[PDB]
Ligand binder design. Structure first.
Ligand SMILES: [Mg+2]
Ligand SMILES: [Zn+2]
Lengths: 134, 121, 375, 182, 38
RNA sequence: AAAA
RNA sequence: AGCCAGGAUGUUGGCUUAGAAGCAGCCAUCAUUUAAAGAAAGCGUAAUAGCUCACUGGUCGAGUCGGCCUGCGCGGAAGAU
């Protein structure tokens, strides 16, 4: 019953994911191959969040989610890391459509009842990372 | 907490909604997590079913053709504002939470006999 | 966790001194490997895992050590049984008892082909190599941070090649004597492959890494019997890398730390920038040199002959011209912006790196290591 | 640099050691070698002393070159070849050899080393802590002049006066000329 | 037990009690917080 | 588990 | 005041870091569904996890909360025939 943000297809048995599943007991290489086979369609290099569901018989199923908004905002602005001092140092610029584009994909993981509400969550996400909206 | 003005604002708004509605269902929502309520909130908006939680004292002030529904308010209370609301509650309550009373035609509907509104087309 | 337990035939201890001694014949006569497992499993089928006296008298070495390491329900144990029949019979006996005393466990047996100790040429060539593959498979399929080598059972000759794996990869090894009662995490002296000895072989492995096969005679002509184990004969007149070879190839491929050096032109230029910029450049080069991730980030325009520029950051008064040889980070020039701009202005037209290395002996060399005793 | 300090000076601050190993993995692997000695310091654990006393030759003094010496050494390479490099390391290794070489002592702790009769090179060195600082490297002709100047006036004080302007910083005697990497 | 002239509530679970004319502090969560005025 |  | 229940979503906010996921440090502290739920007050974890508080909905059916000014008392308070 663990939640991870492993890479798009770079699901190594490496320490980023390796020891996490070990305490439960699921086969490490089994999950790594299963995750990659369905995330090949995902754009390259994305920390797609997956929630693992392990059982008592040492079996597991997992569900993948849309990429995090902060990741989507980082690629939308063409940057790699956020502002060190958000709302003090400004490190990018994205249009409202770029907010709509990110909101639409994350709408599968949002909770707002409208595109405007979903956007405002993304707008709040943008301010918290120093990315101003332009 | 809530001053008289804020409570007066609540009483008017739920009175306005109760005025422009058609049917009401009173349900229990003690012990159900927010996530399952989040699902109900999406379901209620999709089916155009207004849903709110208010104080029973505030509810009884505003609710006075639902007076027959203003007869069982002791314990946690949830209210929703034709048909398909009791249908939605019965499915969720069976699969999860309970129902207490329903309102229709300005008449009470007992909990066992909400099968009428849950089946009407 | 995962326990890579070596398996030894201490389980059938109860047949000590009885007329047919416990040998591969004895397993054979009683029906076979599976049939003999039940006979062995009977003698200690009752003993517990929490009882101290049974741990030290009535159970195998794998069972005693595993019970001491704290085997639980959520565990996975591997038994590297021997190739001999008497070895495998006990393997099928330990597993039945382990899957009985701790239900919900996953024990699987690997039969290391050719692990017999009655022949030398086979053991030197197929035993340790196969055992080296099997262990290195499980560690790489479960991460170095989760495997615990258990070199207590089995022959005394496998133990060198279990612990040595632990030292190289990083997994620990835990051992416990029969009469003792304390688990001993064996010391892990940091070791690696001798880069100096192995460096001339780099082009040789390069062919194999590309064309995946080389004729044997050409391999022998190209290249000291220790190097032989690095190479496994595929069998059709070619040779490919043995499992040890893949370790060496990766060791000769992993990036390492670097120690900066300064050409005679850099040392003249560093000092005149020290007065205006404190001792900032001294730390930056050392910081970049001893961090491979920092080095790969800062590569500005790359020049010929393996030169590539570095810079502290935006709007800085220094940009370095460095290149790598062995474990040394040679620094050729250290120039400010205007000299840097003109160099790149010149390099637009023709080649640049050729002109620098051409005068290496007259102007830049010798490179002196970056240790300073300013006082 | 750190291990040589730890071998001579008993312990070093950990903060200096932490700066030397930026990667977390490096500290994790090399954790066994070092050992906390108290007062925010680390020292070589007996495992470390075994490895270090195996991969490093013994020594008594670590040679260093001033800037003027470096040019002096380079220009003499055409005549004496690599002999100055070997004689410096040998002197720094064995105090018995260093004691033999002392022929004339100047002020402020500077003395001249001559490898013997029939030779041409001569060195002007001084010992600080555990470092063998080398100030100049001269030939037979200049050596007489430098004795004449010191004969009249103090010349040891003149050199130490120009310490921060011509001589320091002292690089270490580790060169790399041929194209080869291990 | 601390015996001080000034006794105070050290955390949220400390209680001030007077027993036989002595102001005492009793803490249900931390035995180090028990003090007595004297 | 001090020649499995 | 006690007792029952909830205490969530963007999101692991960004920076830093091997890890920094409310809870080592820095900056910001918005937004959504909301009866209500801090970009978290406390505990905890190698980091996650887990616990609690703030906040709100129920049960109960008359008062309740902390400041100020002031009279008299209490502790602080152990010595030698
Ligand atoms: Mg008084
Ligand atoms: Zn307390």
């Amino acid at each position: 019953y663990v939640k991870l943000q492993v890479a798009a297809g770079m699901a190594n048995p490496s320490p980023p994911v390796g020891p996490a599943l070990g305490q439960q007991g699921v086969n490490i290489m089994e999950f790594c191959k299963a995750f990659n086979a369905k995330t090949d369609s995902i754009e390259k290099g994305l920390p797609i969040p997956v929630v693992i569901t392990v059982y008592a018989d040492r079996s597991f199923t997992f569900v993948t989610k849309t990429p995090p908004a902060a990741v989507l905002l980082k690629k939308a602005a063409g940057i790699k890391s956020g502002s060190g001092k958000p709302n003090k140092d400004k490190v990018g610029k994205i249009s409202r459509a770029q907010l709509q584009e990110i909101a639409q994909t994350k709408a599968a993981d949002m909770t707002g009842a409208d595109i405007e509400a979903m956007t405002r969550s993304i707008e709040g996400t943008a301010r918290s990372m120093g990315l101003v909206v332009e | 907490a809530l001053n008289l003005q804020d409570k007066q604002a609540i009483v008017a708004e739920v009175s306005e909604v109760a005025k422009g509605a058609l049917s009401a269902v009173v349900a229990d929502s003690r012990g159900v997590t927010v996530d399952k309520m989040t699902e109900l909130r999406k379901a209620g908006r999709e089916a155009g079913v207004y849903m709110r939680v208010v104080r029973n004292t505030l509810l009884r002030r505003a609710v006075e053709p639902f007076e027959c529904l203003k007869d069982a308010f002791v314990g946690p209370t949830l209210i929703a504002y034709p048909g398909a609301a009791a249908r939605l509650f019965k499915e969720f309550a069976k699969a999860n939470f309970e129902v207490k009373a329903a309102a229709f035609e300005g008449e009470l509907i007992p909990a066992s006999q909400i099968d009428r509104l849950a089946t009407l087309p | 966790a995962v326990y890579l337990c070596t398996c030894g035939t201490a389980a059938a201890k109860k047949f000590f001194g009885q007329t047919p001694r416990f040998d591969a014949a004895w397993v054979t006569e009683h029906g076979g490997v599976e049939a003999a497992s039940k006979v062995i499993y009977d003698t200690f089928r009752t003993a517990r895992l929490d009882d101290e006296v049974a741990l030290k008298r009535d159970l195998s070495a794998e069972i005693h050590s595993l019970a001491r390491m704290g085997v639980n329900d959520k565990d996975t144990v591997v038994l590297f049984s021997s190739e001999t029949a008497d070895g495998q019979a006990c393997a099928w006996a330990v597993k039945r008892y382990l899957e009985q005393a701790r239900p919900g466990i996953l024990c699987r047996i690997e039969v290391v082909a050719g692990l017999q100790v009655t022949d030398a040429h086979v053991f030197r060539t197929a035993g340790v190599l196969n055992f080296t593959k099997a262990v290195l498979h499980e560690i790489d399929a479960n991460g170095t941070g989760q495997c615990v080598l258990n070199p207590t059972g089995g022959f005394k000759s496998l133990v060198p090649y279990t612990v040595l794996i632990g030292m190289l990869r990083g997994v620990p090894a835990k051992y416990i004597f029969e009469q003792s009662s304390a688990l001993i995490p064996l010391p892990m002296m940091p070791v690696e492959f001798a880069r100096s000895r192995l460096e001339p072989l780099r082009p040789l492995l390069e062919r194999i890494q590309n064309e995946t096969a080389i004729p044997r005679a050409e391999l022998d002509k190209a290249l000291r019997e220790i190097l032989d184990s690095l190479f496994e004969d595929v069998g059709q007149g070619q040779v490919s890398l043995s499992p040890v070879g893949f370790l060496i190839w990766e060791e000769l491929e992993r990036p390492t730390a670097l120690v900066p050096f300064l050409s005679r032109r850099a040392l003249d230029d560093l000092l005149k920038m020290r007065a205006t910029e404190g001792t900032a450049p001294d730390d930056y080069i050392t910081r970049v040199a001893r961090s491979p991730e920092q080095l790969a980030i800062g590569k500005h325009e790359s020049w010929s002959k393996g030169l590539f520029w570095l810079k502290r950051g935006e709007h800085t008064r220094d940009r370095y011209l460095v290149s790598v040889e062995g474990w040394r980070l040679l620094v050729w020039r250290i120039v400010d912006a205007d000299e840097y701009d003109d160099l790149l202005t010149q390099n637009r037209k023709t080649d640049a790196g050729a002109r620098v290395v051409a005068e290496r002996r007259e102007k830049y060399a010798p490179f002196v290591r970056l240790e300073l005793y300013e006082d | 640099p750190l291990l040589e300090r730890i071998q001579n000076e008993t312990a070093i601050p950990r903060a200096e050691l932490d700066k030397a190993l930026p990667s977390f993995e490096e500290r994790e692997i090399l954790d066994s070698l070092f050992e906390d000695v108290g007062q925010g310091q680390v020292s070589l654990s007996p495992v470390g002393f075994l490895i270090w006393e195996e991969l490093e030759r013994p020594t008594a003094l670590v040679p260093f070159l001033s800037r003027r010496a470096l040019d002096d050494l380079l220009k003499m390479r055409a005549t004496e070849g690599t002999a100055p490099d070997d004689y410096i390391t040998r002197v720094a290794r064995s105090p018995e050899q260093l004691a033999i070489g002392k022929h004339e002592s100047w002020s402020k702790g500077l003395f001249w080393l001559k490898r013997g009769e029939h030779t041409r090179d001569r060195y002007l060195v001084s010992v600080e802590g555990w470092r063998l600082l080398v100030w100049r490297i001269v030939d037979a002709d200049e050596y007489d002049d430098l004795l004449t100047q010191n004969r009249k006036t103090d010349a040891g004080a003149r050199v130490v006066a120009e310490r921060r302007e011509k001589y320091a910083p002292f690089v270490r005697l580790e060169l790399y000329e041929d194209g080869e990497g291990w | 037990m601390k015996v001080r002239a000034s006794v105070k509530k050290l955390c949220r679970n400390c209680k001030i009690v007077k027993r036989d004319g002595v102001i005492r502090v009793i803490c249900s969560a931390e035995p180090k917080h028990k003090q007595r005025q004297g």
